[PDB]
Symmetry: C3
Subunit: 278 residues, 3 copies
């Protein structure tokens, strides 16, 4: 049982680091308001922060950091539901933020004085849809969650792993990145192309990061149904599970990366003026 305590400490350390990172993003977003951002960006970025907080909070309860002993089936289903709600919302919020910025930057209207009320209305309507769709997509998982017996956490049973991977694959990489690739391909041959490749390079490394964090875990879960103390098959499950947990500290860093055309330059101006007078 010594390995279980070590795994509990490692997950808790990652989450505490991730929680500090999220608070830094919240503070960074707060000081970025001086460089007037469009309401569309503000709606998407703030909803991303809320979704990340839900995923971080539910992940620790899923790993049983402090709820060991009281983790029944009712709590296991509720925790797994909240985790996927943040998991699904982040994919949709990032997809809409990328699409909003790709269209805005390409047409040359990405500043505060370049957006209308209708632009803000679409962002609010898109955010409301993404929240509701995430709840609906996470309903099947709330009716199939079960306790973990190798470890002391919460995880969907292996018999539903194939269905779980299919929903996750479409929601995280199937739909969001086919739509992004279709838009980029059309954007690559258009006249509104010169000032979009800096942003396109950011969305390429973002989906690669998402690809290398989500694929190893769910693919292994499906494969464990035929591959059959702890053994080698149990430590690799933990090894591929922490990679999923590291998304709580890497994804929040991409909120600023998609904030504007050159966030690293606007942030310096905002911070320099913040420390000078206000």
């Amino acid at each position: 049982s010594a390995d279980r305590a070590a795994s509990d400490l490692l997950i808790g350390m990652f989450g505490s680091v991730s929680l500090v990172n999220l608070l830094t993003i919240i503070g960074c977003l707060w000081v970025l308001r001086v460089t007037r951002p469009p309401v569309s960006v503000m709606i998407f970025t703030w909803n991303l922060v809320l979704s990340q907080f839900f995923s971080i909070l539910a992940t620790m309860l899923s790993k049983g950091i402090m709820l060991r002993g009281a983790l029944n089936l009712s709590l296991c289903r509720l925790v797994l539901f909240v985790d996927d709600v943040g998991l699904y919302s982040t994919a949709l919020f990032f997809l809409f933020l990328i699409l909003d910025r790709l269209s805005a930057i390409s047409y040359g209207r990405d500043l505060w004085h370049h957006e209308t009320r209708e632009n803000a209305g679409v962002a609010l309507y898109a955010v409301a849809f993404a929240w509701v769709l995430s709840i609906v997509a996470a309903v099947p998982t709330a009716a199939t969650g079960s306790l973990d017996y190798r470890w002391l956490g919460c995880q969907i049973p292996i018999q539903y792993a194939a269905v779980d991977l299919t929903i996750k694959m479409w929601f995280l990489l199937g739909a969001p990145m086919i739509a992004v690739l279709a838009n980029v391909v059309e954007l690559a041959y258009s006249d509104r192309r010169d000032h979009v490749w800096s942003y396109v390079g950011r969305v390429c490394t973002f989906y690669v990061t998402c690809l290398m964090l989500f694929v190893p875990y769910y693919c292994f879960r499906v494969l464990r149904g035929v591959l059959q103390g702890f053994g080698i098959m149990d430590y690799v499950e933990l090894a591929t599970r922490t990679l999923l947990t590291m998304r709580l500290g890497i994804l929040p860093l991409f909120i600023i990366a998609f904030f504007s055309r050159e966030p690293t330059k606007d942030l310096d101006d905002s911070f320099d003026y913040l420390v000078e007078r206000c």
Copy 2:
């Protein structure tokens, strides 16, 4: 069994009301031909009318309004197949009609004399695929239908509720609502933006209406697998199922809402001219 008889009356009244509404749309579409619309609109709208008629006809048989006693497994599977064919076709026809009109209105070419043969050819091929995909997508639900024993209808069992919701979610609001949002987001920053917000307001309330009608019934069916005369869990199933039945009287009203840029103004000219001389 008194409540069951009242259930048939409520569904039967809704179907008769919906049938009257559909006939009004058929008549309204007929009198709208004087304001000669593009062939692309005519192909989509008339195929929608055929799709709605299939859904209305199959829903009455699904509830067992007149087929009680003879509702075996073979008929229940066949009826559930036809009902989902109309359910899937309507989502695809509405998605293609919205996309066709959004592009046509934005570019300023939405009248009869602004379309070519190739525009009509795309609409014909898009309709042909949407009919075939609906048949294919409704094949799995034609091999898993079963008799309902709480009520005297015909519904998919609860063990396939998770799979049923996943297919329905993608078809009704998964693919069509992402594709529409992706186009609208691009349209919000383009020069072809001034005369598209009247139509965008119509597609926003349409998908909200679809969200309010479809989500509660299928989400409850999945949740009923874990929540476990009639009881409270049986009346809420009927309450959340009638909302699905009201789609037969609400969706046909959106056929004219997407007919053109300002259907409420073109309809008045068509009706006023028709009653005068022809």
Copy 3:
């Protein structure tokens, strides 16, 4: 067992014919390099050729042309995994090739001297994702493959037919053609429309061919779960399977069809110049 041997000969003959066709496509692509194509086309077409080779090789092992007797569960799962990897990659590669060429031809920049380094970078990054997604999407198949008993080949059990059709429907005609139809619908109403209808007429017949080759086999497999020596239900399964195997000789013919705007004219110039001097 006489009919079983005949089926082995028919499938083997189709593969040998398909193998010759693929080698002709490889040779045809090699002689098409004189008419300098963009690197984006070269990346997509060559990756398509590799995917067809995987599908051709795995299909023959799946049918047990020469591996009868040693076809265990481990070999059956591996072969079925490879076949879907080629099957899924072809759908994604064809979708990206169509989208790349539709955008390039519409904007008037489809020649070698009209593409930039960023154009080739997107094609390389899109190909890398399509390979990874195909591997991930084929992972569930490797966990559910089983040995065939009515015949001596490899095929998914009928209990997973519903899940198999859902994944295949989305990958082959669900996502790729919704995105294609959405782009074409917008293209039909734009100014960049005059010189795209020759290509659009080519993607309409291609997807119809995919519709009539993939649908019958998977739709029948789901229906066989309720419809219940060899009988009529076993010969139709063979008849509906050779249509799937026939895709190995039809799909490679579409690699050159999507090569450029008018491949039948560029090929003649390339072949005539090759036989003259070099």
